[PDB]
Write an enzyme that holds these catalytic residues in place. Sequence first.
Site, mmCIF file in Angstrom:
data_model
loop_
_atom_site.group_PDB
_atom_site.id
_atom_site.type_symbol
_atom_site.label_atom_id
_atom_site.label_comp_id
_atom_site.label_asym_id
_atom_site.label_seq_id
_atom_site.Cartn_x
_atom_site.Cartn_y
_atom_site.Cartn_z
ATOM 1 N N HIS A 94 21.688 -25.885 -41.854
ATOM 2 C CA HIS A 94 20.866 -27.335 -41.962
ATOM 3 C C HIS A 94 21.967 -28.485 -41.345
ATOM 4 C CE1 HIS A 94 18.349 -25.365 -44.967
ATOM 5 N NE2 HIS A 94 17.457 -25.904 -44.182
ATOM 6 N N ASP A 139 10.099 -26.074 -37.568
ATOM 7 C CA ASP A 139 11.034 -25.990 -38.521
ATOM 8 C C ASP A 139 11.453 -24.341 -38.575
ATOM 9 O OD1 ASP A 139 13.038 -26.753 -40.439
ATOM 10 O OD2 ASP A 139 11.540 -26.935 -42.174
ATOM 11 N N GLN A 172 13.079 -10.155 -44.477
ATOM 12 C CA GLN A 172 12.615 -10.660 -43.268
ATOM 13 C C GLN A 172 11.047 -10.441 -42.833
ATOM 14 O OE1 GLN A 172 14.228 -13.075 -40.974
ATOM 15 N NE2 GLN A 172 14.964 -13.590 -43.013
HETATM 16 C C1 LIG Z 1 13.531 -10.733 -50.899
HETATM 17 C C2 LIG Z 1 15.112 -10.611 -50.165
HETATM 18 C C3 LIG Z 1 15.807 -9.552 -50.854
HETATM 19 C C4 LIG Z 1 16.957 -9.414 -50.214
HETATM 20 C C5 LIG Z 1 17.520 -10.249 -49.291
HETATM 21 C C6 LIG Z 1 16.908 -11.064 -48.561
HETATM 22 C C7 LIG Z 1 15.525 -11.523 -49.284
HETATM 23 C C8 LIG Z 1 14.840 -12.635 -48.659
HETATM 24 C C9 LIG Z 1 13.562 -13.017 -49.043
HETATM 25 N N1 LIG Z 1 13.431 -14.085 -47.933
HETATM 26 C C10 LIG Z 1 14.327 -14.248 -47.160
HETATM 27 N N2 LIG Z 1 15.499 -13.123 -47.658
HETATM 28 C C11 LIG Z 1 14.631 -15.189 -45.937
HETATM 29 C C12 LIG Z 1 13.426 -16.025 -45.943
HETATM 30 N N3 LIG Z 1 13.639 -17.175 -45.042
HETATM 31 C C13 LIG Z 1 13.673 -17.295 -43.736
HETATM 32 O O1 LIG Z 1 14.334 -16.075 -42.872
HETATM 33 C C14 LIG Z 1 13.878 -18.545 -43.034
HETATM 34 C C15 LIG Z 1 13.946 -19.760 -43.368
HETATM 35 C C16 LIG Z 1 13.768 -20.647 -44.688
HETATM 36 O O2 LIG Z 1 13.222 -19.895 -45.779
HETATM 37 N N4 LIG Z 1 14.299 -21.642 -44.917
HETATM 38 C C17 LIG Z 1 14.448 -22.233 -46.306
HETATM 39 C C18 LIG Z 1 15.478 -23.446 -45.758
HETATM 40 C C19 LIG Z 1 15.230 -22.455 -44.451
HETATM 41 C C20 LIG Z 1 14.020 -20.504 -42.359
HETATM 42 N N5 LIG Z 1 13.958 -19.941 -41.251
HETATM 43 N N6 LIG Z 1 13.871 -18.513 -41.768
HETATM 44 C C21 LIG Z 1 14.029 -17.591 -40.790
HETATM 45 C C22 LIG Z 1 12.674 -16.327 -47.277
HETATM 46 C C23 LIG Z 1 12.317 -15.000 -48.028
HETATM 47 MG MG LIG Z 2 14.360 -29.164 -44.839
HETATM 48 ZN ZN LIG Z 3 14.799 -27.815 -41.084
#
Ligand SMILES: Cc1ccccc1-c1cn2c(n1)C[C@H](NC(=O)c1c(C(=O)N3CCC3)cnn1C)CC2
Ligand SMILES: [Mg+2]
Ligand SMILES: [Zn+2]
EC number: 3.1.4.17
Length: 313
Positions: free
Chosen positions: A68, A217, A269
């Site tokens: 960020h 975003d 992912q």
């Molecule tokens: C369920 C689980 C188990 C074990 C390990 C990991 C996970 C897991 C669940 N999720 C993600 N990893 C990443 C995903 N979010 C992104 O990948 C993401 C963002 C983003 O959410 N925001 C908020 C501030 C940035 C921006 N761009 N991208 C690519 C949201 C859900």
């Molecule tokens: Mg933001």
């Molecule tokens: Zn942002």
Amino acid sequence: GLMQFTLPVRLCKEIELFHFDIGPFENMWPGIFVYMVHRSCGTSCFELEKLCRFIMSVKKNYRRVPYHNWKHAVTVAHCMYAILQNNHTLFTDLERKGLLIACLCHDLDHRGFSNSYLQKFDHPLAALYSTSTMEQHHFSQTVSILQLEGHNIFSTLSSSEYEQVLEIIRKAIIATDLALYFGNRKQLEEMYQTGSLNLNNQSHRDRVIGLMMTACDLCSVTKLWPVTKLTANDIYAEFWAEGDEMKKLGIQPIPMMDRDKKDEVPQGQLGFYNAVAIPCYTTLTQILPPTEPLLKACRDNLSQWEKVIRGEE
Ligand SMILES: Cc1ccccc1-c1cn2c(n1)C[C@H](NC(=O)c1c(C(=O)N3CCC3)cnn1C)CC2
Ligand SMILES: [Mg+2]
Ligand SMILES: [Zn+2]
């Protein structure tokens, strides 16, 4: 007036493409943004002296966090630039002005922590803003910087145009709260499919702009795979730091934020591309057909994450 910004030939060509990466040379990012404002808006939209002073105050008010950060700000403004350039006639002069600035300002003074962590920590910003906590802060920081002496890039707008641009920026920045995205896209999906979608309706344009902000975003998912993959490292560097802080408050974090469950990132992912990214760029492509390359790049990256799980990488 007769002073253009001019990029090297590779950047001049690739900057027009949705999948452009702004590169690791920080000192070129201000010039890249001004280039995009001049082509997207016109060389007259802003006094160059005031824009340069605004850009540098915005940069100074982004922190040194893994994701960020100032690079994210410029990256998100570039995706907006690509959408606006591929949809020339659909947007007002005011919208083109406001949305690049909104994108540049949308994460001002981010600490690398979610609205959830602010609330559980009982951070003062959570007392000042009960929902979309960081996003109300980002808009508040935007207004502060606009009111520094010599920083008001909108000074040559009439009073009503000025009120309209700050309202575009406010809604645009609030819309980057991912909690609001689900309901916004569902509404847009309904409106497109029943044919009630009307881009002369202000509340409808607001919704479309909101979805453009989610699309810009999240745009790391629309890059070449190595950009996508290396950006994900920075995103998880923040999430796992927040998980560490959750543990310090005596709260087991969700698996997303628990560095101990790195193994399950690829599956997380997949959930994210299926639940958020693909539906976002799909509805965006239905409403604005020339944004299809974003949907196509997103599906390619979904496929790359499927290959990671299968052990092929
Ligand atoms: C369920 C689980 C188990 C074990 C390990 C990991 C996970 C897991 C669940 N999720 C993600 N990893 C990443 C995903 N979010 C992104 O990948 C993401 C963002 C983003 O959410 N925001 C908020 C501030 C940035 C921006 N761009 N991208 C690519 C949201 C859900
Ligand atoms: Mg933001
Ligand atoms: Zn942002």
